[PDB]
């Protein structure tokens with residue numbers, strides 16, 4: 171099950187391909203300053219509107235960082251310094267449902283040679299089972315994600331799909347230990363879904379719903 | 392604020408803002424692990440000043456954004472330091488590379504203040520507007536950076552007038568307050584030459600579709 175998590179523990183992270191902390195030293199109007207950040211990849215996200223079903227296509231999956239943040243919210247001190255060899259078991263753990271998010275289809279810009287659009291198409295295939303062409307995609311927005319702690323860009327795309335385009339199993343790469351659920355969000359429930367704070371979601375979902383309902387859906391009515 | 396000199400990359404062993412951790416867990420019986428950063432939650436505030444019919448935003452130098460732009464222009468600029476000290480960026484970029492436009496915002500890192508009160512504090516110190524917690528509408532709560540941080544961000548909206556602009560703002564001792572007229576708002580958001588956040592883009596889009604049509 172996606173939401174069945176066991177043995178949850180926190181440990182030190184000495185090196186990682188996904189985050190690499192650095193400090194920028196610089197003078198700003200003659201004052202010497204420093205700033206802590208982490209080097210990270212850019213990313214792409216893609217909102218699909220399935221017109222056969224009149225539903226938006228989203229993904230649901232366990233996010234370990236979200237789970238840890240939620241354990242820390244409900245049990246302050248869970249993420250205390252790991253001053254020991256090896257991980258420290260959480261006491262108490264939360265249910266794994268605490269880390270399950272709803273997101274747009276998304277992936278890192280870590281694919282040598284692929285365009286941003288092609289990365290978006292790859293993720294829509296691998297995560298959702300939808301076959302897209304790059305020219306099917308509309309660029310919605312490009313922006314900085316997390317300006318305080320990283321300098322990564324994210325680019326969001328949009329495309330309309332039909333049922334015939336859902337020709338794959340989706341669910342992410344099985345061999346690589348991914349378990350992703352495809353969510354089809356009926357348009358009639360979409361704004362309520364986004365506004366509901368009991369469903370953990372990203373700003374990309376909330377913005378995607380708002381943007382679609384005000385910029386696209388009227389030109390289909 | 393855009394006059395940045397002698398930029399250099401050094402190591403970051405400890406920081407009160409990012410602490411690298413690894414979650415270890417079993418899912419479907421398989422042992423997994425995930426690298427992330429422990430970080431603070433945050434709040435953002437969109438203000439509509441109806442005296443001026445303008446959205447209140449902030450502009451400031453963001454070092455991480457700057458570093459990201461140097462790495463884009465000169466790959467390898469951010470390689471591991473491997474020295475006794477920081478390594479100068481040569482070539483570098485002008486400070487304008489790191490200048491962003493954002494919503495008023497702050498970390499939830501201080502005991503004593505609710506989310507609403509952090510937002511009022513930031514609106515005062517950054518924008519010079521005096522707000523009350525009860526003046527705030529919660530627009531959205533969401534997770535930013537679910538891959539590496541898991542921290543939560545709450546966005547508030549509130550309506551102000553010039554009668555509430557009782558301070559200068561600009562931060563504490565370089566933040567500039569931006570007043571975006573409603574008529575140019577959408578064009579501002581769409582302008583890809585303006586370095587801005589998803590919070591700004593969503594704030595302008597939300598305001599123009601949920602508030603602006605019912606004004607007046």
Ligand SMILES: CN1CCC(n2nc(-c3cccc(Oc4ccccc4)c3)c3c(N)ncnc32)CC1
Pocket residue numbers: 288289291292301302303304306335
């Ligand atoms: C709406 N429809 C949907 C699909 C239809 N379509 N699109 C492609 C097609 C082409 C080129 C790249 C592509 O996506 C990637 C391929 C590799 C890596 C990353 C993305 C997809 C295609 C095809 N090869 N054969 C038959 N039909 C096709 C036309 C419009």
Ligand SMILES: CN1CCC(n2nc(-c3cccc(Oc4ccccc4)c3)c3c(N)ncnc32)CC1
Pocket residue numbers: 204205206207317318319408433434496497498
């Ligand atoms: C004010 N004073 C002077 C500056 C000092 N400060 N603040 C940060 C820092 C951390 C994380 C987010 C961040 O901005 C956001 C805050 C909320 C929402 C979105 C972005 C800023 C920082 C750093 N990473 N490294 C060194 N100093 C740092 C903090 C105290």
Ligand SMILES: CN1CCC(n2nc(-c3cccc(Oc4ccccc4)c3)c3c(N)ncnc32)CC1
Pocket residue numbers: 188213214276277278346348424425426427537538539
């Ligand atoms: C097989 N896949 C599965 C995961 C595996 N992977 N991916 C990340 C990881 C990093 C940063 C962002 C992220 O997700 C987003 C990507 C785009 C937009 C929004 C979120 C994921 C990661 C980690 N931080 N620690 C350990 N393993 C990790 C390797 C590749």
Ligand SMILES: [Mg+2]
Pocket residue numbers: 275276277278293297
């Ligand atoms: Mg993904």
